Amino acid sequence: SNDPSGYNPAKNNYHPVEDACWKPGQKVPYLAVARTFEKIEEVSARLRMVETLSNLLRSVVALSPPDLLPVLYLSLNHLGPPQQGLELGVGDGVLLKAVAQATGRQLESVRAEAAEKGDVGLVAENSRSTQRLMLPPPPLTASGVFSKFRDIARLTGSASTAKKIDIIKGLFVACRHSEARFIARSLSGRLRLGLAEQSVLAALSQAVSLTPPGQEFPPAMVDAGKGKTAEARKTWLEEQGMILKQTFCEVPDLDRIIPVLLEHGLERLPEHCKLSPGIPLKPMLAHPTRGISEVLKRFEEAAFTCEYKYDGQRAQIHALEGGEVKIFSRNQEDNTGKYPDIISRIPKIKLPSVTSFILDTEAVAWDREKKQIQPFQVLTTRKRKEVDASEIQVQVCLYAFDLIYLNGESLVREPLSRRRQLLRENFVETEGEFVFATSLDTKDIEQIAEFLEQSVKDSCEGLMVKTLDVDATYEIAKRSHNWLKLKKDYLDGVGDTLDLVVIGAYLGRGKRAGRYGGFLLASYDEDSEELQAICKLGTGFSDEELEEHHQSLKALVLPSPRPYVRIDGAVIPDHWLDPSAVWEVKCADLSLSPIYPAARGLVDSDKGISLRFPRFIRVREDKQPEQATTSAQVACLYRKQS
DNA sequence: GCTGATGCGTC
DNA sequence: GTCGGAC
DNA sequence: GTCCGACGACGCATCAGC
Ligand SMILES: *P(=O)(O)OC[C@H]1O[C@@H](n2cnc3c(N)ncnc32)[C@H](O)[C@@H]1O
Ligand code: NA
């Protein structure tokens, strides 16, 4: 058809056949995908992005259904189902090396341009590949590009990085128009679309509803909404959207869903893809809540429970009929090999009447000598894969807080009151191994405030708050953040704030391109009279405040660092700043740092101290660097976490 | 055979 | 993980 | 409220470099 360079999936009255830029049965050109990404990136309304992607997907369904799965993965910037663990092994480092080689430029020139533009894609797009012959290779296809990404991910072992670079250079030699922009962005993990998983699902359900799969070509039905009123069409697409979303939340695996969609259609989907032990599901998440009054505003008169928010890692534990056990992370990564200790303890936690289950738990590092919870930083020293039981050094205690499936029954549509009762009755607590989350069922503001204080004294982050009977199910498609998280550091004037010195700035990427995206901060070490880097900072300022920072710090730029500023192994700022600006910064906790020099030697011989979840609060106009938080004060704050 | 750099996961 | 922007 | 993408610390697994 038309040249893909003119493809317009944002067109009014888009016709899936007549407005496609490829012919029936042809492989979807990658430029059609790139042009769709361009039209998505250009707008800010999600509904417009969804419509534009839906248009592409409808053409793929009508003309080239085998390319639906790769086009979806390209749009998500995924390589496959998360539990399979495919990794490119390519970050900005390898990518920039490949761009420099492909274009015949020095690495430092490419690296500087990428930082100034805030986007590796703009560098790859606007320089020619010097491996080009006079006549270019054939145009890239969507399935071809996706398969090359998978080729990169499958390369392993010694000398594999050079082989990955060879594939990347091969892609850039074949790119036309905007293709190199989005190839580079995909490899760097920054597509910049404004459209991600929820909008992709909305576009997919819309596409297969409007243009049904499986029709004989040319399709008799290219727009199944045309005979409906706008109102009826909206209700219908909402209903179809929810069928897809709820299925995906139970089975978040397009390798499973898309073959079924193409063969049987969306209405029959839940009959083929259902929640089942052994298939990871999307977990229920939590909305930050900045005080107890906000909890009551949110839940109104509905009864709720408060639970300790344990400071570990989420572990979704699956016991299949027949005895097999699998464990998955919050993001569906397979963690079974990480927890041989947990797997051996399953017979100890479940009563013998339990034949299958999916449990929702927090894995927390546990000191068996002292019988107490250990920090997250201890938990993260566990080995990750193919771990044998005898070698475990850091023991774990599971804190169980939900039950999603039991003895063949999905509990996703059941109220927490019932799920929790089934949990409490069919599982067995053992101190230091498997325990139900500490909880309080109350509506008393004074009791809740005291329970929050106690959770912190008992080594937890705060509270989780969950309704028991009103909108109390585990239906992620209806509300993915159905629980509330209440932390003391959310409250204004409560928690540890530090006054820290701005000693450097980093050029922004993406939404921050053309200004500063982050800053390097320092505490004041009284004893050496030096400023010591403590953390970087990149959230907490409004867009207006960030522009004010850019204009107020420009006069402080230095060509070289001051000799009394120490950053050791911290990332060197793009712009050094004369120490002057002092900012109020809040954090959740202080951590022992392998890189930052702040307070090194005061708590640990080799490690200084950094901030967990730092965020900007406000400028301290009334403070100069000498009155910033001292490194000794930092050490005192760390110690009193106990 | 060992260490440092990079990637990508956890929070 | 926190946060603010756009809807 | 939802969705999204800016940005944070940090540590294991892997591979480049030696
Ligand atoms: P994020 O800060 O969004 O918080 C959600 C995670 O908190 C962990 N968690 C600890 N303890 C609980 C309880 N009692 N209930 C729910 N979630 C809890 C989980 O790992 C969440 O992913
Ligand atoms: Na994130």
XYZ file of C-alpha atoms (C1' of nucleotides) and ligand atoms in Angstrom:
701
model
C 0.000 0.000 0.000
C 1.173 3.528 0.814
C 4.710 3.947 2.081
C 4.828 3.209 5.833
C 6.553 6.587 6.209
C 3.104 8.177 5.769
C 1.178 5.722 7.951
C -1.292 7.621 10.152
C -2.895 5.485 12.891
C -4.249 8.673 14.513
C -6.455 9.365 11.457
C -10.135 10.117 11.903
C -12.383 7.303 10.636
C -9.334 5.017 10.546
C -10.118 1.997 8.392
C -8.164 -1.146 9.447
C -7.725 -2.297 5.837
C -7.742 0.860 3.724
C -5.532 2.911 6.061
C -2.926 0.220 6.743
C 0.520 0.665 5.182
C 1.042 -3.010 4.325
C -0.858 -5.605 2.354
C -2.847 -8.597 3.625
C -0.603 -11.415 4.802
C 2.519 -9.222 4.695
C 4.657 -8.886 7.797
C 3.790 -5.743 9.733
C 6.614 -3.247 8.958
C 8.517 -1.968 11.976
C 8.042 1.561 10.592
C 4.279 1.124 11.078
C 4.994 0.469 14.754
C 7.437 3.397 14.960
C 4.895 5.753 13.356
C 2.298 4.591 15.880
C 4.735 5.281 18.707
C 5.318 8.769 17.264
C 1.603 9.556 17.248
C 1.283 8.258 20.813
C 4.270 10.218 22.126
C 2.899 13.417 20.541
C -0.280 13.492 22.678
C -1.008 13.621 26.403
C -4.551 12.171 26.647
C -4.490 8.433 27.421
C -7.779 7.921 25.595
C -6.221 9.291 22.409
C -3.148 7.060 22.847
C -5.394 4.014 23.334
C -7.384 4.841 20.194
C -4.223 5.226 18.121
C -2.747 1.926 19.326
C -6.128 0.215 18.868
C -6.083 1.336 15.222
C -2.702 -0.333 14.642
C -3.819 -3.487 16.452
C -7.023 -3.676 14.396
C -4.967 -3.602 11.195
C -2.676 -6.309 12.610
C -5.681 -8.493 13.478
C -7.269 -7.975 10.076
C -4.158 -8.301 7.894
C -1.405 -10.128 9.816
C -2.625 -11.882 12.992
C 0.672 -13.758 13.652
C 2.266 -10.357 14.328
C -0.195 -9.413 17.089
C 1.924 -10.940 19.858
C 5.245 -9.321 18.788
C 3.569 -5.946 18.213
C 2.085 -6.099 21.732
C 5.450 -6.973 23.275
C 7.110 -4.152 21.339
C 4.450 -1.742 22.622
C 5.035 -2.860 26.236
C 8.825 -3.062 25.750
C 8.681 -6.605 27.143
C 10.590 -9.643 25.935
C 8.034 -12.208 27.054
C 6.192 -13.440 30.139
C 7.938 -12.126 33.266
C 8.316 -15.515 34.973
C 10.588 -16.681 32.135
C 13.185 -14.092 33.154
C 14.473 -13.040 29.744
C 16.934 -10.148 30.024
C 18.574 -8.185 27.225
C 21.712 -7.639 29.276
C 21.972 -4.316 27.434
C 21.874 -1.016 29.289
C 22.985 2.472 28.291
C 26.619 1.367 28.510
C 26.434 -1.375 25.897
C 23.898 0.605 23.878
C 26.077 3.717 23.657
C 29.053 1.605 22.610
C 26.928 0.101 19.830
C 25.682 3.526 18.718
C 29.226 4.900 18.566
C 30.451 1.945 16.506
C 27.409 1.948 14.219
C 27.802 5.665 13.425
C 31.607 5.815 13.291
C 31.813 8.268 16.202
C 33.894 8.410 19.366
C 32.110 7.026 22.418
C 32.579 10.240 24.407
C 30.898 12.334 21.702
C 27.880 10.018 21.610
C 27.706 9.858 25.411
C 27.789 13.653 25.711
C 25.109 14.100 23.045
C 22.858 11.493 24.690
C 23.105 13.261 28.054
C 22.458 16.724 26.591
C 19.447 15.532 24.582
C 18.216 13.316 27.416
C 17.444 10.509 24.961
C 19.710 7.918 23.336
C 17.089 7.526 20.618
C 17.605 11.051 19.303
C 21.323 10.363 18.913
C 20.857 7.107 16.988
C 18.132 8.616 14.781
C 20.079 11.658 13.596
C 23.414 10.021 12.708
C 23.945 7.645 9.797
C 25.225 4.099 10.167
C 28.634 3.956 8.459
C 28.166 0.231 7.768
C 25.434 1.132 5.271
C 26.079 0.105 1.692
C 24.818 2.363 -1.090
C 21.556 0.405 -1.212
C 19.970 -0.257 2.200
C 18.935 -3.687 3.467
C 15.244 -4.575 3.266
C 12.918 -2.723 5.637
C 12.699 -3.965 9.209
C 9.600 -5.906 10.248
C 7.987 -5.871 13.676
C 8.417 -9.628 14.116
C 11.979 -9.387 12.815
C 12.936 -6.686 15.295
C 11.279 -8.516 18.172
C 13.116 -11.720 17.257
C 16.444 -9.853 17.221
C 15.690 -8.513 20.706
C 15.124 -12.103 21.799
C 18.369 -13.125 20.066
C 20.223 -10.517 22.136
C 18.592 -11.817 25.308
C 19.508 -15.441 24.568
C 23.227 -14.675 24.111
C 25.232 -15.800 27.145
C 28.776 -16.505 28.247
C 32.210 -15.151 27.482
C 32.379 -12.732 24.524
C 28.570 -12.437 24.404
C 28.532 -8.635 24.731
C 30.358 -8.131 21.436
C 27.823 -10.451 19.799
C 24.957 -8.419 21.254
C 26.559 -5.248 19.900
C 26.790 -6.854 16.450
C 23.025 -7.485 16.447
C 22.286 -3.919 17.563
C 24.535 -2.462 14.867
C 22.732 -4.662 12.346
C 19.415 -3.154 13.392
C 20.698 0.412 13.074
C 22.068 -0.231 9.568
C 18.561 -1.202 8.444
C 16.654 1.614 10.182
C 14.724 4.242 8.233
C 13.061 7.462 9.402
C 12.187 7.238 13.126
C 12.983 3.531 13.535
C 16.404 4.013 15.143
C 14.852 6.319 17.750
C 12.583 3.583 19.046
C 15.049 0.705 18.645
C 17.510 2.633 20.821
C 14.820 3.609 23.321
C 13.642 -0.005 23.608
C 17.150 -1.303 24.225
C 17.686 1.377 26.882
C 14.313 0.668 28.515
C 12.908 4.193 27.972
C 10.286 4.183 25.216
C 8.855 7.485 26.570
C 5.372 6.785 25.178
C 3.022 7.745 28.002
C 1.283 4.431 27.279
C 2.004 1.258 29.250
C 0.341 -1.949 30.443
C -3.131 -0.629 31.313
C -3.469 1.332 28.062
C -2.130 -1.584 26.032
C -4.810 -3.829 27.537
C -7.481 -1.203 26.804
C -6.274 -0.918 23.203
C -6.205 -4.698 22.800
C -9.728 -5.317 24.110
C -11.012 -2.442 21.974
C -9.207 -3.740 18.889
C -10.474 -7.326 19.067
C -13.981 -6.114 19.943
C -14.191 -3.714 16.992
C -12.361 -5.996 14.518
C -13.006 -9.610 15.540
C -10.185 -12.097 14.940
C -10.648 -15.202 12.855
C -12.641 -13.781 9.945
C -12.145 -14.784 6.333
C -10.322 -12.091 4.384
C -11.533 -9.506 3.549
C -13.221 -9.277 6.959
C -16.983 -8.830 6.805
C -16.847 -6.949 10.120
C -14.140 -4.297 10.411
C -15.991 -2.061 12.928
C -18.428 -3.954 15.168
C -19.288 -0.734 17.028
C -20.663 1.128 14.007
C -24.262 -0.050 14.494
C -24.317 1.002 18.148
C -25.070 4.364 19.675
C -22.072 6.059 21.249
C -23.538 5.270 24.678
C -24.133 1.576 23.981
C -20.708 1.266 22.362
C -18.997 2.741 25.425
C -20.774 0.372 27.819
C -19.973 -2.622 25.600
C -16.284 -1.742 25.270
C -16.083 -1.209 29.061
C -17.543 -4.684 29.641
C -15.201 -6.301 27.129
C -12.293 -4.352 28.608
C -13.029 -5.782 32.060
C -13.128 -9.352 30.727
C -9.624 -8.938 29.324
C -8.289 -7.054 32.347
C -9.549 -9.536 34.913
C -8.201 -12.463 32.893
C -4.821 -10.761 32.509
C -4.606 -9.977 36.242
C -5.113 -13.695 36.959
C -2.929 -14.897 34.045
C -0.571 -11.993 33.108
C 0.949 -13.893 30.200
C 0.297 -12.817 26.605
C 1.862 -16.055 25.318
C -1.177 -17.770 26.864
C -3.849 -15.129 26.215
C -3.205 -14.063 22.622
C -3.438 -17.523 20.981
C -6.758 -17.988 22.789
C -8.030 -14.536 21.779
C -7.267 -15.200 18.119
C -8.797 -18.691 18.156
C -11.816 -18.336 20.481
C -12.416 -14.605 20.995
C -12.582 -12.424 24.081
C -15.971 -13.572 25.413
C -14.720 -17.169 25.804
C -11.364 -16.094 27.260
C -12.096 -16.738 30.980
C -13.073 -20.318 30.081
C -9.510 -20.999 28.840
C -7.308 -18.764 31.030
C -8.110 -18.903 34.759
C -6.251 -18.344 38.018
C -4.369 -21.520 38.912
C -1.554 -22.461 41.315
C 1.732 -22.361 39.440
C 0.804 -19.419 37.198
C 1.800 -16.118 38.855
C -0.890 -13.478 39.245
C -0.884 -9.723 39.708
C -0.760 -8.792 43.420
C -2.965 -6.312 45.223
C -1.174 -3.003 45.734
C -1.541 -0.083 48.123
C -2.356 3.604 47.906
C -0.282 5.966 50.076
C -2.408 7.596 52.746
C -1.038 10.634 54.505
C -2.940 10.328 57.786
C -5.592 8.515 59.747
C -8.234 11.076 58.749
C -7.554 10.272 55.091
C -8.092 6.572 55.842
C -11.545 7.371 57.213
C -12.359 9.670 54.288
C -11.441 6.820 51.951
C -13.239 3.944 53.680
C -16.104 5.995 55.209
C -18.236 3.639 57.362
C -16.794 0.362 56.049
C -15.181 -1.850 58.679
C -11.459 -2.322 58.126
C -8.451 -4.054 59.632
C -5.013 -2.612 60.304
C -1.941 -4.804 59.789
C 1.753 -4.307 60.383
C 3.531 -3.448 57.118
C 6.543 -5.752 57.230
C 9.856 -4.636 55.719
C 10.901 -7.494 53.463
C 10.075 -8.782 49.971
C 6.710 -10.017 48.740
C 6.467 -13.782 48.257
C 3.449 -15.241 46.463
C 3.551 -18.915 47.446
C 1.811 -21.476 45.223
C 1.135 -25.062 46.265
C -0.158 -27.134 43.363
C -2.381 -30.169 43.653
C 0.049 -33.056 43.971
C 2.697 -31.266 46.044
C 4.736 -28.980 43.770
C 5.553 -25.555 45.223
C 6.417 -22.377 43.349
C 7.232 -18.928 44.696
C 6.922 -15.678 42.741
C 7.826 -12.057 43.337
C 5.485 -9.061 43.256
C 6.422 -8.730 39.567
C 5.911 -12.412 38.651
C 9.598 -13.326 38.722
C 10.221 -16.973 39.549
C 11.794 -17.066 43.017
C 11.343 -20.795 43.655
C 15.089 -21.504 43.511
C 15.784 -18.695 45.995
C 13.830 -20.264 48.891
C 14.616 -23.961 49.352
C 14.134 -23.351 53.072
C 10.563 -22.112 52.551
C 9.754 -24.975 50.209
C 10.884 -27.554 52.762
C 8.684 -25.902 55.398
C 5.387 -25.990 53.451
C 4.258 -29.281 55.099
C 4.731 -27.499 58.428
C 2.564 -24.471 57.578
C -0.506 -26.120 56.009
C -2.914 -28.512 57.627
C -3.087 -31.930 55.948
C -6.560 -31.181 54.549
C -5.090 -28.452 52.321
C -4.518 -29.804 48.806
C -3.680 -26.545 46.973
C -3.272 -22.854 47.769
C -1.895 -19.469 46.782
C -0.672 -17.448 49.773
C 0.252 -13.760 49.902
C 3.174 -13.207 52.299
C 6.093 -10.977 53.169
C 9.450 -12.731 53.434
C 11.418 -11.021 56.208
C 14.989 -11.659 57.313
C 14.922 -13.289 60.752
C 17.639 -13.675 63.404
C 17.140 -17.080 65.027
C 19.781 -16.406 67.690
C 18.045 -13.252 68.940
C 14.571 -14.243 67.671
C 13.934 -10.953 65.921
C 13.307 -9.295 62.570
C 16.363 -8.079 60.645
C 16.572 -5.127 58.213
C 15.829 -5.286 54.491
C 19.552 -4.829 53.824
C 20.167 -8.201 55.481
C 17.441 -9.906 53.456
C 18.969 -8.677 50.200
C 22.212 -10.591 50.906
C 20.427 -13.894 50.232
C 21.561 -15.557 47.042
C 19.065 -15.399 44.210
C 18.920 -18.571 42.093
C 19.691 -22.282 42.343
C 20.256 -22.066 46.096
C 20.743 -25.273 48.100
C 19.222 -25.486 51.568
C 22.392 -26.237 53.534
C 24.048 -23.033 52.274
C 21.448 -20.547 53.553
C 22.969 -17.991 55.925
C 20.138 -15.464 56.292
C 17.004 -17.164 57.598
C 13.554 -15.877 56.617
C 10.246 -15.674 58.471
C 7.070 -15.499 56.395
C 4.395 -13.054 57.516
C 1.196 -14.222 55.844
C -1.566 -11.730 55.146
C -3.784 -13.121 52.382
C -5.060 -16.271 50.742
C -5.999 -16.080 47.082
C -6.837 -19.723 46.271
C -7.661 -22.765 48.397
C -8.390 -26.395 47.519
C -9.431 -25.540 43.962
C -11.444 -22.421 44.888
C -10.368 -19.052 43.552
C -10.973 -16.491 46.306
C -10.500 -13.383 44.140
C -14.191 -12.406 44.355
C -14.453 -13.214 48.090
C -14.328 -10.563 50.827
C -11.201 -10.271 52.934
C -13.218 -11.256 56.012
C -13.693 -14.717 54.487
C -10.233 -15.047 52.889
C -8.643 -14.146 56.224
C -10.768 -16.651 58.128
C -9.760 -19.401 55.696
C -6.125 -18.353 56.124
C -6.304 -18.419 59.927
C -8.059 -21.764 60.094
C -6.169 -23.856 57.525
C -2.573 -22.782 58.172
C -0.321 -23.275 61.183
C 1.840 -20.631 62.854
C 5.415 -21.334 63.951
C 7.304 -18.486 65.612
C 10.171 -17.253 63.464
C 9.085 -19.338 60.446
C 5.456 -18.660 59.496
C 3.246 -16.143 61.291
C 0.028 -14.274 60.510
C 0.521 -10.526 60.155
C -0.127 -8.698 63.413
C -3.500 -7.004 63.120
C -6.091 -4.821 64.801
C -9.780 -4.578 63.876
C -10.883 -1.142 65.064
C -12.334 2.203 64.042
C -10.919 4.118 67.037
C -8.523 6.835 65.844
C -6.590 6.711 69.120
C -6.105 2.928 68.936
C -5.006 3.164 65.297
C -2.461 5.879 66.081
C -1.083 3.771 68.932
C -0.982 0.666 66.719
C 1.008 2.641 64.134
C 3.508 3.653 66.817
C 3.780 0.022 67.927
C 4.365 -1.275 64.392
C 7.433 0.975 64.135
C 8.697 -0.136 67.551
C 8.220 -3.726 66.316
C 10.536 -3.217 63.297
C 7.867 -2.475 60.661
C 7.336 0.377 58.211
C 3.863 1.372 59.336
C 0.413 -0.041 58.675
C -1.587 -1.588 55.884
C -5.314 -0.824 56.073
C -7.865 -3.035 54.322
C -11.648 -3.201 54.297
C -13.160 -6.464 55.493
C -16.492 -6.655 53.639
C -17.145 -3.545 51.504
C -15.182 -3.556 48.226
C -12.935 -6.020 50.017
C -12.195 -8.534 47.256
C -8.942 -9.440 45.470
C -10.127 -8.272 42.022
C -7.136 -6.310 40.748
C -8.928 -5.385 37.517
C -11.552 -3.492 39.531
C -9.022 -1.662 41.704
C -5.335 -2.494 41.759
C -4.581 -0.294 44.800
C -7.446 -1.466 47.010
C -5.338 -1.384 50.194
C -3.996 1.685 51.988
C -0.446 2.142 53.281
C 0.048 4.429 56.279
C 3.649 5.366 57.127
C 4.852 7.859 59.725
C 7.121 9.527 57.170
C 4.011 10.416 55.138
C 2.863 12.829 57.849
C 3.912 16.467 57.605
C 6.365 17.316 60.368
C 6.722 13.633 61.346
C 9.750 11.515 60.526
C 13.387 12.213 59.815
C 14.123 15.245 57.667
C 17.668 16.344 56.938
C 19.034 19.655 55.677
C 21.484 18.743 52.934
C 23.817 20.689 50.654
C 23.434 20.621 46.872
C 26.875 19.827 45.438
C 26.072 18.715 41.885
C 23.388 18.377 39.239
C 22.601 15.745 36.608
C 21.122 16.517 33.205
C 17.554 15.313 32.864
C 16.258 12.493 30.686
C 12.844 12.063 29.105
C 10.260 14.255 30.853
C 13.234 16.091 32.392
C 15.145 16.633 29.141
C 16.486 20.157 28.812
C 16.710 20.777 32.561
C 18.215 19.029 35.575
C 16.624 15.721 36.514
C 18.595 14.973 39.666
C 20.976 16.417 42.223
C 23.850 15.227 44.384
C 23.489 16.059 48.084
C 25.975 16.191 50.954
C 26.105 16.346 54.732
C 28.640 18.474 56.604
C 31.434 16.588 58.383
C 32.441 18.808 61.299
C 35.672 16.943 62.035
C 37.236 17.236 58.570
C 35.254 20.385 57.639
C 34.336 18.668 54.382
C 31.049 18.120 52.588
C 30.402 14.397 52.104
C 28.055 13.093 49.440
C 25.143 11.265 51.062
C 22.596 10.584 48.292
C 21.136 11.772 45.020
C 17.723 13.392 44.771
C 15.210 13.305 41.958
C 11.674 13.547 43.309
C 9.589 15.805 45.525
C 9.775 19.037 43.522
C 6.949 20.299 41.364
C 7.751 21.157 37.772
C 7.711 24.832 38.767
C 10.097 24.227 41.672
C 12.435 22.273 39.402
C 12.603 25.163 36.945
C 13.351 27.449 39.899
C 16.191 25.124 40.912
C 17.634 25.253 37.410
C 17.690 29.062 37.395
C 18.968 29.456 40.968
C 21.771 26.889 40.599
C 23.042 28.069 37.195
C 25.129 30.802 38.854
C 26.777 28.140 41.061
C 28.119 25.930 38.268
C 31.851 25.244 38.619
C 34.208 23.691 36.032
C 35.882 21.554 38.718
C 34.921 20.364 42.204
C 35.871 22.230 45.342
C 38.674 20.391 47.191
C 36.603 20.152 50.400
C 33.769 18.227 48.674
C 34.139 14.435 48.822
C 31.978 12.127 46.702
C 34.163 8.978 46.526
C 32.352 6.460 44.292
C 29.194 8.488 43.684
C 28.225 9.214 40.096
C 30.162 12.290 39.008
C 27.710 15.187 38.465
C 27.257 16.572 34.982
C 27.566 20.031 36.576
C 29.538 20.629 39.756
C 27.933 23.258 42.001
C 29.545 25.690 44.424
C 28.158 24.527 47.804
C 25.523 27.036 48.816
C 21.979 25.727 48.420
C 20.565 23.748 51.343
C 17.407 21.673 50.879
C 15.134 19.925 53.339
C 14.975 16.231 52.436
C 12.796 13.498 53.917
C 13.498 9.770 53.933
C 11.966 6.574 55.273
C 15.161 5.174 56.817
C 18.917 5.478 56.624
C 20.984 2.683 55.083
C 24.614 1.534 55.208
C 26.088 2.516 51.847
C 28.763 0.741 49.784
C 29.450 4.004 47.899
C 28.564 7.193 49.768
C 31.233 8.686 52.075
C 28.860 10.500 54.453
C 29.668 9.489 58.035
C 31.986 6.681 56.911
C 33.785 5.331 59.962
C 31.201 6.555 62.472
C 29.003 3.409 62.396
C 30.978 1.131 60.078
C 34.647 1.133 59.106
C 34.092 0.754 55.359
C 30.565 2.065 54.765
C 29.054 5.503 55.019
C 25.345 6.203 55.279
C 22.724 7.041 52.653
C 18.966 7.698 52.579
C 16.183 5.250 51.748
C 13.472 6.841 49.540
C 14.823 10.428 49.689
C 12.573 13.227 48.486
C 12.742 17.001 48.272
C 10.482 18.901 50.689
C 11.522 22.563 50.435
C 14.470 24.920 50.120
C 16.086 26.077 53.372
C 16.695 29.716 52.448
C 17.836 30.311 56.034
C 20.668 27.764 55.978
C 24.166 27.817 54.546
C 26.288 24.676 54.145
C 27.958 25.017 57.549
C 24.536 24.689 59.216
C 23.425 21.656 57.217
C 22.829 18.314 58.917
C 26.181 17.022 60.106
C 27.643 13.622 59.360
C 27.636 12.979 63.118
C 23.902 13.743 63.208
C 23.426 11.322 60.302
C 25.182 8.607 62.299
C 22.989 9.324 65.326
C 19.846 9.024 63.199
C 21.058 5.693 61.834
C 21.832 4.250 65.268
C 18.428 5.097 66.721
C 16.702 2.907 64.150
C 18.294 0.205 66.366
C 40.843 -17.583 38.842
C 40.017 -12.935 40.635
C 38.049 -8.094 40.694
C 35.368 -4.252 38.767
C 31.620 -2.654 35.780
C 27.174 -3.262 34.162
C 22.409 -4.812 34.234
C 18.374 -5.430 36.459
C 15.963 -7.042 40.129
C 14.322 -5.803 45.133
C 12.369 -2.089 47.962
C 10.185 2.648 46.418
C 8.165 8.600 46.292
C 6.347 12.030 43.766
C 3.768 15.275 40.620
C 1.408 15.853 35.926
C -2.465 14.995 32.909
C -6.614 13.251 32.453
C -8.542 7.789 41.505
C -5.899 5.954 37.533
C -2.082 5.748 34.900
C 2.369 7.052 33.821
C 7.293 8.047 33.873
C 10.629 11.090 35.961
C 13.799 10.036 39.725
C 16.039 7.266 44.608
C 19.517 3.155 47.370
C 21.450 -1.084 46.911
C 23.211 -6.093 45.989
C 23.487 -10.575 43.412
C 24.713 -12.609 38.729
C 27.193 -12.165 34.990
C 30.863 -10.991 31.901
C 34.937 -7.781 30.491
C 39.248 -7.205 31.612
C 42.908 -8.600 33.558
P 4.315 -0.476 48.875
O 5.043 0.534 49.736
O 3.321 -0.050 47.825
O 3.612 -1.467 49.904
C 3.078 -2.713 49.487
C 3.963 -3.871 49.882
O 4.002 -4.014 51.308
C 4.373 -5.334 51.631
N 3.625 -5.729 52.842
C 4.185 -5.883 54.083
N 3.292 -6.226 55.027
C 2.093 -6.277 54.331
C 0.776 -6.564 54.738
N 0.452 -6.880 56.016
N -0.191 -6.540 53.798
C 0.123 -6.228 52.534
N 1.326 -5.935 52.039
C 2.287 -5.971 52.993
C 4.078 -6.216 50.414
O 5.300 -6.744 49.932
C 3.486 -5.226 49.400
O 3.876 -5.473 48.068
Na 8.718 2.424 39.178
